[PDB]
C-alpha cells in the first residue's frame, strides 16, 4: 500500500486500486466540534449523493449514463493510463454538475421501472 | 421541477416524482452546532430505519408486508390519484408504528432465509 493519497500521482487505473485507503481516512472546544461535525456533513453529503444514484454500497459504481464525448474526447488509454485523477478532475470540472444531474435522473427511472417490474404477477 | 416541497400539494403519485428533491434538502456557536447535529441525527435515524427494513439504498422500496385494509381501505385510485401525502400521513398516522414493526420483522426473516439459501452447496 502507498498510504493515504499515495496514489495521487499515479495513473487513474492504478489509483482505482486504493479507493479504500482514502475512504477509511474520510472519517478517521467549539472549534473541535465544528470541524468534526463538518467532516461528518461532508461524508454524509457524498454518501447521500451516491445513494440517490443507487451507489450506496459501492466504491466503484457502474451506472447506465452514456458518456457524451463533449465532456472529454480522450479514449480509454489516454484517460486511464496517461492521466492522474487530479488532471481528470481539472479537465471534467465544468461538466461535473451535468453528469450528476444525469445520474440522478437515470436512477429515478430505474427505481420506477423496478417498481413496475415487481408489479407483474 | 417544482423545487423542495413543490409537490406537497400534488397527488401522491405525482409527488413520487420529486423524492430526490426533498432528500437533498435534508442535509443541505452552540445554537448553530445543535441545529446541525440535530439535522444529522434525524437523517441518520431515518437511514438506519431504512437499513433495518432492507431499503438502505432506495428512495422507493417495495416490501413483503401485505396491506391489512384496517390501516386504510381506500383503493389505489383514491390513494394515489385523489390524495396528497399530507392527507395520507394524517390518515395513516395511527398505524405507522404497526407498519414499521412489521417491516422490521419481515426483513429479519428474509435475512435468515437468505443466510440459509447461501449455505446450500
Amino acid at each position: 500500500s502507498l498510504g493515504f493519497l499515495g496514489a495521487a500521482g499515479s495513473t487513474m487505473g492504478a489509483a482505482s486500486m486504493t479507493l479504500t485507503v482514502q475512504a477509511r481516512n474520510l472519517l478517521s472546544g467549539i472549534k473541535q466540534l465544528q470541524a468534526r461535525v463538518l467532516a461528518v456533513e461532508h461524508y454524509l453529503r457524498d454518501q447521500q449523493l451516491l445513494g440517490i444514484w443507487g451507489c450506496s454500497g459501492k466504491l466503484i459504481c457502474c451506472t447506465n449514463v452514456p458518456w457524451n464525448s463533449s465532456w472529454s474526447n480522450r479514449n480509454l488509454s489516454e484517460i486511464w493510463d496517461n492521466m492522474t485523477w487530479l488532471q481528470w478532475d481539472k479537465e471534467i470540472s465544468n461538466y461535473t454538475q451535468i453528469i450528476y444531474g444525469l445520474l440522478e435522473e437515470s436512477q429515478n427511472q430505474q427505481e420506477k421501472n423496478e417498481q413496475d417490474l415487481l408489479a407483474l404477477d | 421541477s417544482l423545487g423542495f416541497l413543490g409537490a406537497a400539494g400534488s397527488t401522491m403519485g405525482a409527488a413520487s416524482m420529486t423524492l430526490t428533491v426533498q432528500a437533498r434538502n435534508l442535509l443541505s456557536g452552540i445554537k448553530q452546532l445543535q441545529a446541525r447535529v440535530l439535522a444529522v441525527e434525524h437523517y441518520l435515524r431515518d437511514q438506519q430505519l431504512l437499513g433495518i427494513w432492507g431499503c438502505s439504498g432506495k428512495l422507493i422500496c417495495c416490501t413483503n408486508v401485505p396491506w391489512n385494509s384496517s390501516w386504510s381501505n381506500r383503493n389505489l385510485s383514491e390513494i394515489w390519484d385523489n390524495m396528497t401525502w399530507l392527507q395520507w400521513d394524517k390518515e395513516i398516522s395511527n398505524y405507522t408504528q404497526i407498519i414499521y414493526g412489521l417491516l422490521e420483522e419481515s426483513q429479519n426473516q428474509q435475512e435468515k432465509n437468505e443466510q440459509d439459501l447461501l449455505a446450500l452447496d
Partner: antibody
Amino acid sequence: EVQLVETGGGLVQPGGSLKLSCRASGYTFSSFAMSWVRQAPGKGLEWVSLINDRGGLTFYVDSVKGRFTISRDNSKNTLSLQMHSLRDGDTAVYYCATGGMSSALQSSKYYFDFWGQGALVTV
Amino acid sequence: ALTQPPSVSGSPGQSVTISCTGTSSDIGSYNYVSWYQQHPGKAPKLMIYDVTQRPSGVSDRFSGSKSGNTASLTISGLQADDEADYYCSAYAGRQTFYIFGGGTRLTVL
C-alpha cells in the same frame, strides 16, 4: 370517445423493414400501457408486444423477440412498432390496444380494453 | 395457446357457454381470464376482464367464471346480434405475457 387509428404500409417483401404507427385520442395516452396483438387471416388472436405507459419497459412474444421494436412518443400520442426481418409467418392484421399492464400505483389491467381498427401487413 | 370449442350454438334466448382449458401455470395460478367478441371484419371488443368483471357498456347477459384450470363465458338470452367469434385470453407470467385460445364461432340458429 376513445379512438385508435393505425397507419402504415400494407405490403413488404420478405426480409423487409416496416413501421406501423397507432395514434390515440379520447383518453390520456400517457396514463395507459399499450400492446400490439396479431391475427393471421386464418388464425385467432396472438399477442405480439407490450409497452409500458412511460415507454421504459418493453416485452415481446418469443417469436419476435429479436426482430421487433416497440416504442411510444407520449407528446404526439403515438405508439409505433418497427418490424425487421418480417418473415412470412408475420403476415397478419395487426391491432394496437390499450391495457395489459399498469404502473404499480394503478389498478391492474391484464386485459385489452380498447382496440383499433387494425392494419393488414402482407409479407 | 388455449383449447376452445371450434364452435358452439343455441336457439335465440338460450344460454350458451364457451369454455377454455389451460394448465396450472396459466388459467389456474393467475385469475386474469378475459373474453373478447370479434365480429367478422371488425376488431375484437372487450366483454369480460378479470374472472368475473365486465366493462361498463357490456350487457348483463355476458358473464363468466373460473374453476381449476377451466375458464368459461356464459351468454344468457342469446340474441341475433351475438353471432361472433369469441376468444378468451389469460395472463401466463413474466416470460410469456398473454395466451389467446382458438376462436369459437357462436352462431344463432
